[PDB]
Amino acid sequence: MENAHTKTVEEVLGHFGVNESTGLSLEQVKKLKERWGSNELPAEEGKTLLELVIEQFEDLLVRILLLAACISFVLAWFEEGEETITAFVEPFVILLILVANAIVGVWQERNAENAIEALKEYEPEMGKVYRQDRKSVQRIKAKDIVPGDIVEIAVGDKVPADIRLTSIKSTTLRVDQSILTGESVSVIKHTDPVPDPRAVNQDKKNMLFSGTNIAAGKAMGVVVATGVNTEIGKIRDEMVATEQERTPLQQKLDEFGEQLSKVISLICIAVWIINIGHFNDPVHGGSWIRGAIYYFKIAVALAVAAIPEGLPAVITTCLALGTRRMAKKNAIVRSLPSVETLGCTSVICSDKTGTLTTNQMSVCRMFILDKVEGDTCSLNEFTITGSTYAPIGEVHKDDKPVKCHQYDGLVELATICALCNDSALDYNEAKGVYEKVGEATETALTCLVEKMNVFDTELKGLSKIERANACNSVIKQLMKKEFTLEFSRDRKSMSVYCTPNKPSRTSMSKMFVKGAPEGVIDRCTHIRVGSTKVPMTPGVKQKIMSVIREWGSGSDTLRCLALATHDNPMRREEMNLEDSANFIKYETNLTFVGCVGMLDPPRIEVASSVKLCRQAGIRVIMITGDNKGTAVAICRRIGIFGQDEDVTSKAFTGREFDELNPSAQREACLNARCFARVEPSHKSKIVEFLQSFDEITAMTGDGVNDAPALKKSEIGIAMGSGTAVAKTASEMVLADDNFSTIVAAVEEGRAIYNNMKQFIRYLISSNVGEVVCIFLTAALGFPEALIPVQLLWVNLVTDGLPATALGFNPPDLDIMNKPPRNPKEPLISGWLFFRYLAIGCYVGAATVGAAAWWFIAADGGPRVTFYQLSHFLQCKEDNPDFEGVDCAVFESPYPMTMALSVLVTIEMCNALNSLSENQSLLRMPPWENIWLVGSICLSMSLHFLILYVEPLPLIFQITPLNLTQWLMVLKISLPVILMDETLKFVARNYLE
Numbered sequence: 001m002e003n004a005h006t007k008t009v010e011e012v013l014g015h016f017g018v019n020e021s022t023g024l025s026l027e028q029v030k031k032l033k034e035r036w037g038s039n040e041l042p043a044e045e046g047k048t049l050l051e052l053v054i055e056q057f058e059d060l061l062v063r064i065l066l067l068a069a070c071i072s073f074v075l076a077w078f079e080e081g082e083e084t085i086t087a088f089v090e091p092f093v094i095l096l097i098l099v100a101n102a103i104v105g106v107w108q109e110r111n112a113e114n115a116i117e118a119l120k121e122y123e124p125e126m127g128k129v130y131r132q133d134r135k136s137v138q139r140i141k142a143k144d145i146v147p148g149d150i151v152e153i154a155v156g157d158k159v160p161a162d163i164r165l166t167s168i169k170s171t172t173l174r175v176d177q178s179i180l181t182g183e184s185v186s187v188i189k190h191t192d193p194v195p196d197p198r199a200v201n202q203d204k205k206n207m208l209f210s211g212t213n214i215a216a217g218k219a220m221g222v223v224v225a226t227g228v229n230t231e232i233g234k235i236r237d238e239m240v241a242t243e244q245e246r247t248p249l250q251q252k253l254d255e256f257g258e259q260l261s262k263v264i265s266l267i268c269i270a271v272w273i274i275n276i277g278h279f280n281d282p283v284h285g286g287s288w289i290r291g292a293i294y295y296f297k298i299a300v301a302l303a304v305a306a307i308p309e310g311l312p313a314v315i316t317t318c319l320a321l322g323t324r325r326m327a328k329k330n331a332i333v334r335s336l337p338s339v340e341t342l343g344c345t346s347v348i349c350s351d352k353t354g355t356l357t358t359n360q361m362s363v364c365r366m367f368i369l370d371k372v373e374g375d376t377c378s379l380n381e382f383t384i385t386g387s388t389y390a391p392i393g394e395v396h397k398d399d400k401p402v403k404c405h406q407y408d409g410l411v412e413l414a415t416i417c418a419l420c421n422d423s424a425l426d427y428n429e430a431k432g433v434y435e436k437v438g439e440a441t442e443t444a445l446t447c448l449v450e451k452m453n454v455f456d457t458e459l460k461g462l463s464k465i466e467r468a469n470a471c472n473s474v475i476k477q478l479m480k481k482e483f484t485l486e487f488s489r490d491r492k493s494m495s496v497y498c499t500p501n502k503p504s505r506t507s508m509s510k511m512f513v514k515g516a517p518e519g520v521i522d523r524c525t526h527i528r529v530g531s532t533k534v535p536m537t538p539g540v541k542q543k544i545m546s547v548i549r550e551w552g553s554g555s556d557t558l559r560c561l562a563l564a565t566h567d568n569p570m571r572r573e574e575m576n577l578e579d580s581a582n583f584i585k586y587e588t589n590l591t592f593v594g595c596v597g598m599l600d601p602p603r604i605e606v607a608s609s610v611k612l613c614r615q616a617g618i619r620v621i622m623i624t625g626d627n628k629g630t631a632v633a634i635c636r637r638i639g640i641f642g643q644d645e646d647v648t649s650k651a652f653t654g655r656e657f658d659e660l661n662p663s664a665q666r667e668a669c670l671n672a673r674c675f676a677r678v679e680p681s682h683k684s685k686i687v688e689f690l691q692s693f694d695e696i697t698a699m700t701g702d703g704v705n706d707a708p709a710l711k712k713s714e715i716g717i718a719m720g721s722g723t724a725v726a727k728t729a730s731e732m733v734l735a736d737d738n739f740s741t742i743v744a745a746v747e748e749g750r751a752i753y754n755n756m757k758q759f760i761r762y763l764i765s766s767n768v769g770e771v772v773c774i775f776l777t778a779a780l781g782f783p784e785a786l787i788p789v790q791l792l793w794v795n796l797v798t799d800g801l802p803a804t805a806l807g808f809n810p811p812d813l814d815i816m817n818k819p820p821r822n823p824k825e826p827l828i829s830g831w832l833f834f835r836y837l838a839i840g841c842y843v844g845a846a847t848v849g850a851a852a853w854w855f856i857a858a859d860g861g862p863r864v865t866f867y868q869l870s871h872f873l874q875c876k877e878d879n880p881d882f883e884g885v886d887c888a889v890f891e892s893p894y895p896m897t898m899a900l901s902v903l904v905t906i907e908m909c910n911a912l913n914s915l916s917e918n919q920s921l922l923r924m925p926p927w928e929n930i931w932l933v934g935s936i937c938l939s940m941s942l943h944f945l946i947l948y949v950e951p952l953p954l955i956f957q958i959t960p961l962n963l964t965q966w967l968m969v970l971k972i973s974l975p976v977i978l979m980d981e982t983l984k985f986v987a988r989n990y991l992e
């Protein structure tokens with residue numbers, strides 16, 4: 001049964017045919033057990049490691065390299081037995097990189113924590129029900145509770161299901177709804193029906209929600225919904241939903257893979273049509289099996305040349321080195337790709353309570369009476385500092401520090417706050433911070449007494465635990481509280497009856513009252529001025545409320561409590577405490593002492609972080625569960641709104657948002673910076689609209705209610721003081737709760753993005769140069785210039801060192817002054833594609849020309865034969881036109897090691913040209929990045945180690961170039977820098 005909050009307790013009881021006294025029977029439970037099942041949150045199992053590694057191989061471009069792995073394994077299977085050691089190097093190093101990138105991709109995207117497990121912690125193991133088989137209350141598992149059961153709930157217990165309240169056994173019933181509402185303040189509940197079925201969970205005072213706990217009181221009720229039907233069940237339904245979101249860089253590289261896969265297939269057929277016919281007259285060079293061996297060797301080389309192997313390594317290396325840089329700022333990155341996404345975020349959604357505010361209530365202001373003249377009175381306004389429950393602070397009067405031991409009106413004010421309290425302060429030894437005991441509102445008064453220190457009690461040489469209650473224990477030794485008049489909804493106040501201890505015969509009993517200002521001071525017939533007592537004037541009572549109104553409804557917008565006392569209370573025996581309605585009569589003729597305002601203070605660095613995101617073009621939108629008045633008040637402090645700014649169309653509540661038509665809801669998500677009284681389902685609903693607009697959203701909650709908005713967001717952020725559910729649902733956690741890490745992570749995320757796309761183009765320009773080299777030798781007919789074994793060493797070891805160093809390029813000075821980049825922007829531009837194509841064509845001709853140089857230059861090699869070079873496959877000894885030259889020169893390492901040195905040297909040049917896009921190398925010196933110069937030296941010296949170390953040149957088929965051949969490769973490769981510089985000059989000084 002749903003929407004039972006609109007129906008009376010008798011109607012709901014009549015729906016299940018149950019008697020609230022005897023509850024359900026055993027035969028009716030079994031009938032309800034079948035249809036509604038057991039009451040629990042089902043668990044969502046995660047994908048295992050065997051399934052995640054398979055999805056790495058399902059990519060289209062991975063299947064291309066995997067295809068070349070099997071072809072090279074068959075090509076190495078047909079090789080002669082003498083060369084077998086060097087033959088299997090190709091398929092193994094291909095399979096080596098194939099498996100290496102497979103596990104790196106899984107280790108990168110894997111989320112090791114499950115949010116459903118943290119959500120199932122709120123399900124209580126046991127519950128208390130009334131059933132027909134027992135005359136009294138029974139205790140059973142929460143799994144066996146079915147809708148229609150009559151349950152009893154007491155203080156401290158967790159609510160096993162969603163329950164319609166029937167009878168409240170205590171005076172008032174208080175609940176902690178922070179699960180759904182995100183707010184830690186207790187809520188008063190009743191049994192009366194609530195109209196307006198569209199009302200949110202915050203507006204239903206007759207319902208108990210599963211996972212919440214009871215702050216105080218005792219009551220009973222009937223279970224409307226169990227299992228997934230509850231409100232916590234609506235949370236996990238949005239938790240199990242995962243769209244496999246991918247960061248924009250992963251999204252474009254995923255598309256670039258299918259765009260590259262079509263080219264590799266077309267280039268294979270492009271060489272196949274230029275392939276001389278082996279079915280007609282290839283001089284019968286081989287058998288029918290030997291005809292397809294060249295097409296397989298050229299396709300493997302085309303795949304190894306086009307596919308940028310090692311790219312998953314340099315990307316993952318940049319993410320891990322960026323995650324470590326963020327951990328030093330106390331930001332724990334739970335998803336490696338998510339450090340890049342935070343650079344392009346155009347909007348930041350933030351929960352107010354626990355994130356923008358300290359979640360700990362503190363007294364902001366207080367006042368007492370100063371002087372009374374006629375019907376007009378003057379007040380002394382005081383302010384109290386500190387954002388936390390830590391009993392530290394100093395009271396200021398009119399912008400001057402003052403000690404309150406000399407104000408007798410303040411001493412009695414602190415007397416009321418300590419003496420009438422159900423709460424206490426506590427110091428956590430493990431957490432190292434002061435926690436709260438009981439109500440957070442009453443705890444704010446406890447801190448005030450310690451921070452005021454009216455009696456000048458010595459606080460030095462006192463333990464941190466003893467310091468919590470230190471100033472309260474003194475007042476407890478003074479006055480003895482005999483009993484307490486419980487808080488009741490009618491009078492909106494409470495009181496305590498205390499008698500002095502030390503002034504036994506010189507003093508008499510008194511009664512201290514606190515409550516809502518309207519209901520209290522109307523029962524106050526006097527005003528406390530210092531230690532004296534003056535009658536309450538209608539002109540005085542009008543001036544008193546004039547201040548309390550400006551505190552509640554003003555730009556401050558603080559909660560207020562009127563503090564009054566009864567000097568001559570009624571006698572002990574004359575008070576019968578069973579009926580709660582008599583308490584408003586017992587508290588009367590009070591003397592108004594003072595009033596104390598309180599607020600949940602915003603965090604210190606939040607207001608400064610908002611101004612920085614505003615300069616970066618990043619909006620901030622508060623989505624909270626608190627009231628609209630308090631939220632707008634916080635937004636004016638932190639800078640989201642202006643003090644005089646009109647919030648009319650810029651702020652909405654939960655029901656107001658749902659009431660709008662879908663066309664009106666769209667406009668709100670764009671222009672509205674504040675959303676209050678928001679159900680957890682609406683937190684994800686707001687973020688869902690921002691994603692429909694092609695915006696990159698960042699959601700920072702601390703709460704269980706924030707979990708849907710966190711999981712739905714592309715990059716979520718969690719507070720270290722937040723619940724475990726909010727941590728497992730996000731990609732990032734702030735351990736120190738510093739909000740300035742958000743603006744520091746956006747700066748760290750933009751520097752990575754500019755460097756990532758920089759080496760992405762460097763590695764992608766190196767591949768097009770290797771395709772032109774392998775396509776030109778196949779069209780001309782020259783022997784192989786580059787072996788795919790050599791290309792893998794160039795793609796991984798040679799080009800991986802400067803590519804990783806390109807991630808260390810110094811960021812921009814104004815980088816945080818730029819608006820967020822377009823998430824749909826291409827990786828390459830029109831002029832950038834023409835440039836990488838022009839550069840790739842020069843290196844392709846430089847490596848092919850290097851092999852043609854050794855043959856045609858006739859220094860150390862044979863003389864120049866062009867017809868014999870393209871036709872070299874037709875060379876067999878005793879054939880004319882080959883007279884004078886050896887037929888084995890085509891397999892010599894010299895032409896290949898000539899092209900390999902040209903390829904490596906050019907890649908050291910392109911690595912140097914990758915410092916800045918359009919800037920020159922003279923105005924941007926090469927030493928601006930030290931890691932890049934060191935990467936070139938290591939990569940260049942590794943090109944020597946591959947030649948000289950004994951086993952290496954046999955598998956790679958290379959030899960040293962001695963003295964002279966290096967001068968040919970250095971003069972041919974160096975113009976790459978001059979050629980690229982010209983393409984940068986016309987783009988910088990002319991194109992734009």
Ligand SMILES: CC(=O)C1=C(O)N2[C@H](C1=O)[C@H]1c3c[nH]c4cccc(c34)C[C@H]1C2(C)C
Nearest residue numbers: 056062065098101102105253257309310311
């Ligand atoms: C087994 C494994 O997980 C993988 C791989 O083994 N790889 C990458 C890859 O995902 C491939 C890839 C997919 N999309 C792109 C864009 C740009 C570059 C690459 C890729 C490199 C690819 C390869 C083969 C290195």
Ligand SMILES: [K+]
Nearest residue numbers: 710711712713
């Ligand atoms: K998420």
Ligand SMILES: [Mg+2]
Nearest residue numbers: 056101102105
């Ligand atoms: Mg992969």
Ligand SMILES: [Mg+2]
Nearest residue numbers: 182353354703
């Ligand atoms: Mg919160």
